[PDB]
């Protein structure tokens with residue numbers, strides 16, 4: 001499963017923003033941090 005991540009329900013265990021499984025919450029909660037930032041897709045070629 002690489003593409004096509006959607007459905008009906010909530011997954012407070014694994015991050016949905018990107019989709020990455022963690023081992024310990026400690027690291028899980030932290031991950032969100034990076035997400036907090038703008039996290040812009042990216043500029044156009046050039």
Ligand SMILES: [Zn+2]
Pocket residue numbers: 015016017018019020031035
């Ligand atoms: Zn994420």
